[PDB]
Design a protein around this ligand. Structure first.
Ligand SMILES: NC(=O)C1=CN([C@@H]2O[C@H](COP(=O)(O)OP(=O)(O)OC[C@H]3O[C@@H](n4cnc5c(N)ncnc54)[C@H](O)[C@@H]3O)[C@@H](O)[C@H]2O)C=CC1
Ligand SMILES: NC(=O)C1=CN([C@@H]2O[C@H](COP(=O)(O)OP(=O)(O)OC[C@H]3O[C@@H](n4cnc5c(N)ncnc54)[C@H](O)[C@@H]3O)[C@@H](O)[C@H]2O)C=CC1
Ligand SMILES: NC(=O)C1=CN([C@@H]2O[C@H](COP(=O)(O)OP(=O)(O)OC[C@H]3O[C@@H](n4cnc5c(N)ncnc54)[C@H](O)[C@@H]3O)[C@@H](O)[C@H]2O)C=CC1
Ligand SMILES: NC(=O)C1=CN([C@@H]2O[C@H](COP(=O)(O)OP(=O)(O)OC[C@H]3O[C@@H](n4cnc5c(N)ncnc54)[C@H](O)[C@@H]3O)[C@@H](O)[C@H]2O)C=CC1
Lengths: 319, 308, 318, 309
């Protein structure tokens, strides 16, 4: 079978669930949340439209037993957008991550909750699963937003546009301008001043707008959901169909790019049935690798004092 | 060539939008609403996922000039507490900008608002249709699949009449694998099968009681009607249409009937006997549109409004 | 791992493979054939289109090692009908071919669902079931799934609607003695049997004869039939690999049913999912339908009881 | 509506037809061929499977009156150095524009670069409506060879093969890249005789893989069938995607002759919106001019009574 579990019947979870059923990727959809009513309501609503889909079974319950033998588990629980956010979201992940592995040992966890980069490391610690099976959303949407900003810029489809945004999902995202190209035309060679301050084509602004556009939409409708459901389902299609496609997702970066701390950052990785086949370790400019080490230093700065990651009880360890 | 305009960016509004984009049906998505912030925010979110879709352009604006030359217009806007006051502002404007178009009314009651849309638009009958009992039929086929352990597609059930209660369920048409389920149980739907029919009616009431609104079930059915129409498949669907002169009905009412849907809209309606107890429920539906809309407000927007 | 193997790179086989890749039902497509050049030729030709497909691995080799751990095996190998040949004439030839390809499939794919396409499908599904040793719920034949597709299309152009909106069920033997259950023929729930051998409506019985003559006509025109059957095979695979639990008219074991007394494979409405054939709908047909249904089984076993290749011992009796 | 005509019901012809039906692109498929039996048999075969398709009408006839009001016409008719197809194109191309002038013609018959030019003259249609198969298939074969050696999906590794559809092709090594990194940057000897990875042999296999297919099974079928289906989808949906189709190169890259060469172009409902003028290297522009020089000499033997207007 192809069982997929969605922990979160909110705006991002339902957008993800509707994208899974729209792609016929799952034969058994499992919805898990803490709201009894909202959980049963979204399940029945999805079940009523099961005639127009190809997912026979759609089970949903608060007990994680309905998630048994799931291939992929998409975690969308928590609260939206700061050390406060990560402190309270790891509080939720502490009660749901160990329960997912208890019923779905051979699954692939997809962390969506923000901060993704941090919560993916939190998920990898409490789950005990290999790092190649714990993948986070990361900059898979940052590259989609960047590729769309270039689509309406040149007048072509985002498919023909190729722009890679890596690093940390947020303002500290790295824009590898050497890979920005369409139709095999490296635009960095047309404009050698790409990314710097003295740039005719302010690509620095369109790079910043990738983070702004995410912040803006949260001001107008109050959230973001559709761009992720399509991005999350796009990752599962690469994984379930064994396509072995390269995607910029958050992965264990320690030991790569001169970083020594156990953190998760977005990098190109191949996705098949097993999860992360390999993590592309390309060569970046001196300034691009600077943010990779700086953001990882800031990421580890938070996770090192996360007392929700306690594997042992000997915690008279006050400081 | 395949421009689709969705009026309303609410729950049902975006449910059809994400379902239309999930099917590569429209090369142009136009969203309209009164709340420009939610209207602009929802459009920008769908745009960020353009890489994973096959729609070149997604536009949105309060002005209806952005909905010009649309092949399909889905009306999902809505607030005796009827929605004609809102319909008088959203309907005359879509036809002004896209005359040659097809209308899919979704606001409740579907059978009532679809008639006001046809009157305010002046378009023919085949181009003004509503969801009707297409969702009630899908809900009914799921209950048969849940009890029989098969797929709703392999199941076959036809719910007609009004959207919700007072709906008709043809028991002679209920069948699976060609086997008429009424033949195995001659006393089907009579003194259990009527609860299954009433469960369709109350399956929605439970949804709004839990999550507060019906969302994805309707959005998927609207995309199913759009696919069968934009592809000229000429498929049969139980949509709400004008049924004057059929089954002893002599009033301009809109009821759910099995109709053929394609690029020209509602070309034909399926002729059926419906026994005798079922034919009455269609005439018993004289409380819809008649009795209700005979005390209408103003199904014609006039500039003389120094009123209140 | 949704691995699919296609035995036979002929017209029907290639039409099945192109339909499987079109729907992205398999992540690993294995091809097996005796013609090694054509086998390797069709592989590279399909592999060049990997850019527009969703199947990463496309392997092909005459040895059945490339078929290990296959979920569904579509068998299209054998000799083809020729002009005005009879479907019951290609038996001794394709049964001898099935003698060397069916056992080899189970050796490398013990847990798999075999789909028989080679004609006569009703006879060879029985030969496969006996040669493979797998349960009857996993040895499924094409049956009348295509016969119903051609029937529901003929009534589609007649009523001006889509074949999907049409609802017709053709059961029995795939070919001449097909049983057209007119009691189940309906459109939008309206059983079009309002008309009630002669008049029908205009002739709601020539359409059945057209389903039988359609196969011969296409063979007389282009020489074979591959596209129509190729799409029907993909429809059955989609119902299995996706656990759709949909009802299809496929050939299955029908003993005990309709008074049939000996092991015979006939087409009946069956529910297909990941487990294969999980249920068979036993309708209550008219006395004329069960008579033609049973008659098709009498002639079927008559040809199966003498086949000198399913002999596992040394039967020198003539 | 989205009517599509496929001229020729042969192997390559039916590979496209079965591909357009598998994507629900057109609502009416029209087949045209000279053989009555094969044309009618292939038509009824597709009609029998109408249940599993989203195509209502499927027609076929000898006269081109059945192809009236078509949006895209795929010309895959001819014979698999002696141009026996320009004679056949004389009797079929004018018939297409006579019953459906407002359309887009996709040439598939080989030599495409020679026949797409022949189509452009007989049809008299704008250059943005005459499409040739070009190196879009050569790019798919090239991207697969990169995926075969890297263990990834062909859609993840990007490569652009331009020039002629055949032996004299151009591999823009400056456009090859996987995961956003320039493969030429990793190995600067890409394309030269000092290649550490022998990429010139990979380019040679692209123009030789088609030879192997015709040697094993006798013809190339499904590779081109899926390629044309990808170009039609980028057009019928106005996706505005960049594809290396065969287009005119007169004026650009210094060629002052009217020839057709494979170059990346934006495909949408109109056909060709733009033709990318990539700044190629010296050895690449030389081949694009050397091939265009000899190709015009091939299409200078217009003494099959074409001789311009
Ligand atoms: N990586 C990305 O691109 C983005 C990530 N997100 C993430 O989605 C998350 C929230 O999902 P949203 O739909 O935006 O808001 P939401 O208010 O709908 O929260 C999602 C669900 O989590 C539930 N929940 C909280 N704790 C739970 C627990 N212990 N067990 C089960 N359910 C629990 C809530 O009931 C809710 O239904 C946030 O962390 C947010 O950052 C959303 C936008 C962008
Ligand atoms: N046909 C069916 O089976 C179903 C019926 N519905 C109907 O759909 C309608 C909307 O349902 P929801 O989306 O869940 O409520 P909603 O409040 O989330 O969306 C309704 C939309 O109307 C907009 N609106 C109101 N007046 C407008 C105007 N003059 N112009 C533009 N936009 C206007 C509001 O912005 C709103 O977004 C209701 O009438 C409801 O009864 C809901 C589910 C299924
Ligand atoms: N069940 C059904 O509904 C249908 C039945 N069919 C059947 O499909 C069959 C195939 O028709 P075609 O592909 O057009 O003729 P074909 O001449 O292409 O034969 C198919 C393949 O069998 C191969 N073959 C022969 N012995 C083999 C072996 N031992 N191992 C592997 N491959 C072997 C040949 O190389 C060939 O490529 C016919 O027997 C026909 O009756 C056709 C239409 C529908
Ligand atoms: N661009 C590319 O990469 C490809 C090039 N091709 C070309 O496509 C052409 C056909 O290839 P195949 O289908 O495998 O050979 P084929 O002999 O099977 O089909 C060619 C069709 O032309 C028909 N025909 C001849 N004159 C006609 C006319 N005046 N009107 C209508 N039909 C006519 C024949 O009946 C035949 O069916 C060849 O020229 C070949 O070089 C083949 C594969 C791909």
């Amino acid at each position: 079978n192809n069982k997929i579990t969605v922990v979160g019947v909110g705006q991002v979870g339902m957008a993800c669930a509707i994208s899974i059923l729209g792609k016929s990727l799952a034969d058994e959809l499992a919805l898990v949340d803490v709201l009894e009513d909202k959980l049963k309501g979204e399940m029945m609503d999805l079940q009523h439209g099961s005639l127009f889909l190809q997912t026979p079974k759609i089970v949903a319950d608060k007990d994680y037993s309905v998630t048994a033998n799931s291939k992929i588990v998409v975690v969308t629980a928590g609260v939206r957008q700061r050390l406060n956010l990560v402190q309270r979201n790891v509080n939720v992940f502490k009660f749901i991550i160990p329960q997912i592995v208890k019923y779905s040992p051979d699954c692939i966890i997809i962390v969506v909750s923000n901060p993704v980069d941090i919560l993916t490391y939190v998920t990898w610690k409490l789950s005990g699963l290999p790092k190649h099976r714990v993948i986070g959303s990361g900059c898979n949407l940052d590259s989609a937003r960047f590729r769309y900003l270039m689509a309406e810029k040149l007048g072509i489809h985002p498919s023909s546009c190729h722009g890679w945004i890596l690093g940390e999902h947020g303002d500290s995202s790295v824009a590898v301008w050497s890979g920005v190209n369409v139709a095999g035309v490296s635009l960095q060679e047309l404009n050698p001043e790409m990314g710097t301050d003295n740039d005719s084509e302010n690509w620095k602004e369109v790079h910043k707008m990738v983070v702004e556009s995410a912040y803006e939409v949260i001001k107008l409708k109050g959230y973001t959901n559709w761009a992720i459901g399509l991005s999350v389902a796009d990752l599962i299609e690469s994984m379930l169909k064994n396509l072995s496609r390269i995607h910029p997702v958050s992965t264990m970066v320690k030991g790569m790019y001169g970083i020594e701390n156990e953190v998760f950052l977005s990098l190109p990785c191949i996705l098949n049935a097993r999860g992360l086949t390999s993590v592309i370790n390309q060569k970046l400019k001196d300034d691009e690798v600077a943010q990779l080490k700086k953001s990882a230093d800031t990421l580890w700065d938070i996770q090192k004092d996360l007392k929700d990651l306690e594997n042992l009880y000997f915690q008279g360890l006050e400081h």
